[PDB]
Amino acid sequence: QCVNLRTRTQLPPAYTNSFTRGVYYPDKVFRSSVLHSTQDLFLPFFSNVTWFHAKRFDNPVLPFNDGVYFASTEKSNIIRGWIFGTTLDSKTQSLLIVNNATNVVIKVCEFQFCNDPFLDVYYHKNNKSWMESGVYSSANNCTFEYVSQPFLMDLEGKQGNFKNLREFVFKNIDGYFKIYSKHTPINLVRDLPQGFSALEPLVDLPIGINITRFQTLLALGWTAGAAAYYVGYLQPRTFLLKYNENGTITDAVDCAL
Amino acid sequence: TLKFNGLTVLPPLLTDEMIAQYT
Amino acid sequence: SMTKTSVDCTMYICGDSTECSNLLLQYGSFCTQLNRALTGIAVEQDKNT
Amino acid sequence: DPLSETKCTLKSFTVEKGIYQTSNFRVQPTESIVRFPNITNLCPFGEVFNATRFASVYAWNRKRISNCVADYSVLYNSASFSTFKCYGVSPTKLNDLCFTNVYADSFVIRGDEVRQIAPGQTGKIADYNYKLPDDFTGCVIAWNSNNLDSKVGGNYNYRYRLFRKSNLKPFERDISTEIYQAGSKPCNGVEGFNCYFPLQSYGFQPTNGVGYQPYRVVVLSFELLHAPATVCGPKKSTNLVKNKCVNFNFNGLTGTGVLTESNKKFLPFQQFGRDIADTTDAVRDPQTLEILDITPCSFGGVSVITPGTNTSNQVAVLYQGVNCTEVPVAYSTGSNVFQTRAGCLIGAEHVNNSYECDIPIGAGICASYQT
Amino acid sequence: NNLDSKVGGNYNYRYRLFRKSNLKPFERDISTEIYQAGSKPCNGVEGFN
Ligand SMILES: *[C@@H]1O[C@H](CO)[C@@H](O[C@@H]2O[C@H](CO)[C@@H](O[C@H]3O[C@H](CO)[C@@H](O)[C@H](O)[C@@H]3O)[C@H](O)[C@H]2NC(C)=O)[C@H](O)[C@H]1NC(C)=O
Ligand SMILES: *[C@@H]1O[C@H](CO)[C@@H](O[C@@H]2O[C@H](CO)[C@@H](O)[C@H](O)[C@H]2NC(C)=O)[C@H](O)[C@H]1NC(C)=O
Ligand SMILES: *[C@@H]1O[C@H](CO)[C@@H](O[C@@H]2O[C@H](CO)[C@@H](O)[C@H](O)[C@H]2NC(C)=O)[C@H](O)[C@H]1NC(C)=O
Ligand SMILES: *[C@@H]1O[C@H](CO)[C@@H](O[C@@H]2O[C@H](CO)[C@@H](O)[C@H](O)[C@H]2NC(C)=O)[C@H](O)[C@H]1NC(C)=O
Ligand SMILES: *[C@@H]1O[C@H](CO)[C@@H](O[C@@H]2O[C@H](CO)[C@@H](O)[C@H](O)[C@H]2NC(C)=O)[C@H](O)[C@H]1NC(C)=O
Ligand SMILES: *[C@@H]1O[C@H](CO)[C@@H](O[C@@H]2O[C@H](CO)[C@@H](O)[C@H](O)[C@H]2NC(C)=O)[C@H](O)[C@H]1NC(C)=O
Ligand SMILES: *[C@@H]1O[C@H](CO)[C@@H](O)[C@H](O)[C@H]1NC(C)=O
Ligand SMILES: *[C@@H]1O[C@H](CO)[C@@H](O)[C@H](O)[C@H]1NC(C)=O
Ligand SMILES: *[C@@H]1O[C@H](CO)[C@@H](O)[C@H](O)[C@H]1NC(C)=O
Ligand SMILES: *[C@@H]1O[C@H](CO)[C@@H](O)[C@H](O)[C@H]1NC(C)=O
Ligand SMILES: *[C@@H]1O[C@H](CO)[C@@H](O)[C@H](O)[C@H]1NC(C)=O
C-alpha cells in the first residue's frame, strides 16, 4: 500500500572520508601472529563515500556494483532494513531484509514494490505494529524464506547516550549473498570515525540472482528520530592484513593507497 | 632471531655445545 | 654453514598419491639427482664447520 | 634387509664404510575418518508423503521445497510404497546426492492410470492433466490407497479431466470447467448435444478391482544444477579418533595427519587454522566444538649405517627425526634401540666412551665397529 | 547390415547393460546371473527389480 511522499527533491549528495574502515575477515580461517596478504573486494582506504543523513529525512534509491559498505552512526534504531534486486517490479526476484525490535525476515518472492516504498512504525492500518508487508503487493511466487533473532539489537554502556556505529558489508559472489558486520560505541558529531575494527561474517544465503540496485528501510504530518547513513562501493584490490596472537585482524594496509 | 611436504632439515654433527667447546 | 636440507621428491611432487608417482617414473633418475645435490651440500656443512 | 636396500640403491654388491640414504619412512594412515555437520533441518516429507488428504490429478498440487536435508531412509526403506521408481539415479545414491530446486507434486489416480504418470505415455491422465517429459530426471513414488481414499458410495471428490480440445504439455495445469465441443457445432449455455462438461469424478469404492482401486502419487520433481544448492541428501559422519595418524575429512577439508587437541581459541565464525605458509595446521570439530592441531603423519629418511661389506654384514638404521615410539608401526622387534637428537637409531649399542668420529650419525653422535 | 541384419530383429547379437563395476582391460564376462538394481536379494531365475 503506497503512502507516497515525493516531498524532498533530489539533492546534491554529501561526501565524507572513510578512513581505515570496513575491512572484513576474507574466509573462516584462523591465521595468527601473521602478516597475510589477500585479494578480494574491499573498500579503498581514505576514499570519499556518499554521506546521507536523516525536517531531517533521507530515503534515496541507488545502484549496486559487486558489493557495498553500508554504515550508520545512529541512536534509537530508526534504520531497519534493505531491498536488493535488478528491476524492482516482479519481472525478476528481488531479495528483502527486514528487522524489527528483534527478529529478522529474509525473503526472495518477486515483490512488486512502489516508487517510494518504506515501512514506518506501524499504527492503525490493519492493527498496531503490522507485518512487514507495506513495501509491496505480491508474494505468490515465494522462492525463499529465512528468519533469525537479533540481527541489529542494542548495546548498553549507560543506555546508549553516544551514537553507536553499526557497519555492514553486503556482497554477492557465486550465487551466495553474504553479510559481515560490527557494532561499536564512539563520540563524534558528523563523521565516520578515524579508527580500526573488523567486520565478522554474520550470515550467508544461496539466493543465486542478478542483483543491481538497493534501498534502505527506516521508520517514522509525521515525526521521527534522525541520524546519518553512509554508502561506499567495494573495489578489486590487494590488502596486507595483520592478525594478532589471538588470530583477529588487528591492523590492515591497502597496497594501492 | 630464528617438517612439511616431504621437506626436511638435518641436524649438524657439531652441536652448539661442541662448537662452544672448540671455541 | 647454513641449514642442511633434504627432500622426499615423491612426497613434494606426488604427496600421498600413487597415481602421480607413476607419471613421475616416466622422468626417471631426476629425483635422485636432486637428492644427491642436497646430500652433497649437507655433508659440506659439517665439513665447513 | 636394510643392507640389501643400500646395495640396491647404491647399485653395488660390496659397499664401502659409511652412512647411506635409502627410501624414506612414512607412517600409513590407521583408518579413514569422516567428520561432517549433524543431520539437522530435514525436508517436509511428513507433510508431502504423509499429508492426510491429497489433491485431484486434474488440479495437481506443486509443493515447492528449499533450505533442508533430504534423508530418504524413512522413505525407500519402508515397504509402504508399492511403486517407488527412480528414472535418473539409483534410489540408494540419493543420500549422497544434491538437488537445486525441488517441487513435490501430490495427487490421486486409478492404479490402471499410475503407469501413465511414467514419462512418454498416453491415456487420459497423460493426455489431459499430468504428462511427464521424455527426459524426466526426478523420481516417482506411488502407492495403493484403497484403505484411505475409497468410499462405499464412491469417492467422487477425487476427479480426472476426461475431455480436452487438445493433448497438453509437460507441467501444464488446467482449472477450466468450460464446455467441451465434441461436434463441429458451436456449444452455448451449460449443456446440449455433443456439449460435454470436461471433468469426471472417480468411483473409488473399497470393493474396486486392484488397479481400479485408488492410488496416491507423489512426483518428486526437481530441476537441477543451474543455481546454488539449497537442498541435499544427508552427509553421514563418524566417531572422532585422536593421537593416531589417519586420513581425515572435516566438512570437505579432506587430508591426512595425527589429530591432537589444540590450545588455540577460534572466534565463533572460524573453522580452519592456517600457517605462515597458508598450509592447514588446525581445525574445529563441526559437532562437539573444539580446536584440533593437525600434525602430518610422522615421516623421515631411512639411513643405513654400515661398516664396509668387505668387513661385516651387520648393520644399523636411522629414522631421521622420528621418536622411537613411532617406529613400531613398521626390525620393530627392536632388541637394540636408541633415541637421539638425530632420530631413532635401531640395530646398534650405545657406549659412554667417546671415541674419535668414525661414521657420522649427526647431532653429536658417531658410530663404529668394535669389540 | 547386408550380412547380419533381418527385418523382424536379428536378436542373436547381445551386449551387457549391468555389472558389479567396470570390467578390467581385456576381461570377458560370460555371466547370466540376475542383477540386483533394488536393495532386495533375489534368489531364483527372476524377481521384482
Ligand atoms: C507416516 O507417519 C507414521 C507415524 O509416524 C510413520 O510410521 C512410523 O514408521 C517408523 C518406521 O517404520 C516406525 O519406527 C520404528 O520402527 C520399528 C517398530 O515398527 C522400530 O524397530 C524402530 O526402532 C522405530 O522406532 C514408527 O514406529 C512408525 N510410527 C507409528 C507409531 O506408526 C510412517 O513411516 C510415516 N510415513 C512416511 C511416508 O512419512
Ligand atoms: C517482528 O517480526 C517477526 C517476524 O516477522 C514477527 O514474528 C511473526 O509474528 C506473527 C504474529 O505473531 C506470526 O504469525 C509469525 O509466525 C511470526 N514469525 C515467526 C518466524 O515466528 C514479530 O511478531 C514482530 N514483532 C514486532 C514487535 O513487530
Ligand atoms: C516466478 O514465477 C515465474 C513464473 O512461474 C518463474 O518463471 C519460470 O521459471 C522457470 C525456471 O527457470 C521456467 O522453467 C519457466 O519457463 C518460467 N516461466 C515463466 C512464465 O517465465 C520464475 O522462475 C519464478 N521465480 C522464482 C524466484 O520463483
Ligand atoms: C587474547 O585474548 C585473551 C582472552 O581475552 C587475553 O587474555 C586475557 O588477558 C587479560 C588481561 O591480562 C586477563 O584479564 C584475562 O584473564 C586473560 N584471559 C585468559 C583466558 O587468560 C589476551 O591478553 C589477548 N591477547 C592479546 C594480544 O590481545
Ligand atoms: C550433534 O548432536 C549432539 C547430540 O546428538 C549434540 O551434542 C550434545 O550436546 C549436549 C549439550 O552439551 C549434550 O547434553 C549431549 O550429550 C550431546 N550429545 C552427544 C551425542 O554427544 C551436538 O550439539 C550436535 N552438533 C552440533 C553442532 O550442535
Ligand atoms: C619421545 O616421545 C615421548 C612421548 O611419547 C617423550 O616422553 C615424554 O617426555 C617428557 C619430558 O621428560 C615427559 O613430560 C612426558 O611425560 C614423557 N611422555 C611419555 C609418554 O613418556 C620423549 O621425551 C620423546 N623423546 C624425544 C627424544 O623426543
Ligand atoms: C572526492 O570528492 C571530491 C569533491 O569534494 C572530488 O573532487 C574528488 O575527485 C573525489 N575523489 C575521489 C577519489 O572520489
Ligand atoms: C491484530 O489483529 C490480527 C488479526 O487481524 C491478530 O492476529 C493479531 O494478534 C492482533 N494483534 C494485536 C497486538 O492485538
Ligand atoms: C543479468 O543476468 C543475465 C543472465 O545471467 C545477464 O545476461 C545480464 O547481463 C545480467 N544483467 C546485469 C545488469 O548484470
Ligand atoms: C676385502 O675382502 C678380502 C676377502 O675377500 C680380504 O682378503 C681383504 O683384506 C679385504 N680388503 C679390504 C680393502 O678390506
Ligand atoms: C653411562 O654414563 C651415564 C652417565 O653419563 C649413565 O647414565 C649410563 O647409565 C652409563 N651407561 C653404562 C652402560 O654404564
- Resolution of the determined structure in angstroms stands at 4.3
What is the gyration radius of the CA atoms in chain D, in angstroms? 36
Q: Closest ligand to A111 CA? A: 3
Ligand 2 site: residues with CB under 6 angstroms? A 100-101, 103, 105, 129, 132, 147
Under DSSP, the state recorded for A88 is S
Mutate to test the interface with C, among D9, D20, D24, D320 (most CBs of C within 10 A): D24
Binding partners of C (≥3 Cβ pairs within 8 A): B, D
Does D363 sit in the ligand 6 pocket, CB within 6 Å? Answer: no
* Residue D175 three-state SS: coil
Name the CATH superfamily housing domain A14-257.
Answer: Spike glycoprotein, N-terminal domain (2.60.120.960)
Q: Where are the domains of chain A?
A: 14-257
Ligand 4 site: residues with CB under 6 angstroms? A 244-246
Question: Which of A34, A242, A246 maximizes ligand 4 atoms within 8 Å of its Cβ, making it the mutation to test the pocket?
Answer: A246
**A78 Cβ contact list (under 8 Å, min separation 6):** A54, A218, A219, A224, A225, A226, A227
Residues from E contacting D (CB-CB < 8 Å) are 37, 39
D133's grid cell: 517429459
Q: Are residues A150 and A202 in contact, defined by beta-carbon separation less than 8 angstroms?
A: no
**Calpha distance A32→D264 (Å, rounded):** 10
D22 CB within 8 Å of a chain C CB: no
Residue A233, by phi and psi: left (phi above 0), alpha (psi -120 to 50) or beta?
A: beta
Q: D281 — phi, psi (to 5°)?
A: -120, -15
Q: Closest ligand to D340 CA? A: 6
C17 CB within 8 Å of a chain B CB: no
Min Cα separation C26/chain D (Å): 18
The C-alpha cell 485431484 sits at: D56
D148's grid cell: 484411505
**Calpha distance A254→A196 (Å, rounded):** 13
Among residues D294, D282, D281, D289, the alpha carbon closest in space to that of D243 is found at: D294
| β-strands D245-250, D231-232 pairing | unpaired
* Residue D84 three-state SS: strand
Buried b (16+ CB within 10 A) or exposed e, D330-345: eeeeeeebbebebbbb
Q: Are residues A201 and D269 in contact, defined by beta-carbon separation less than 8 angstroms?
A: yes
**Calpha distance D236→D159 (Å, rounded):** 42
Solving technique: cryo-EM
**Calpha distance D235→D287 (Å, rounded):** 13
Q: Do B3 and D321 touch (CB under 8 A)?
A: yes
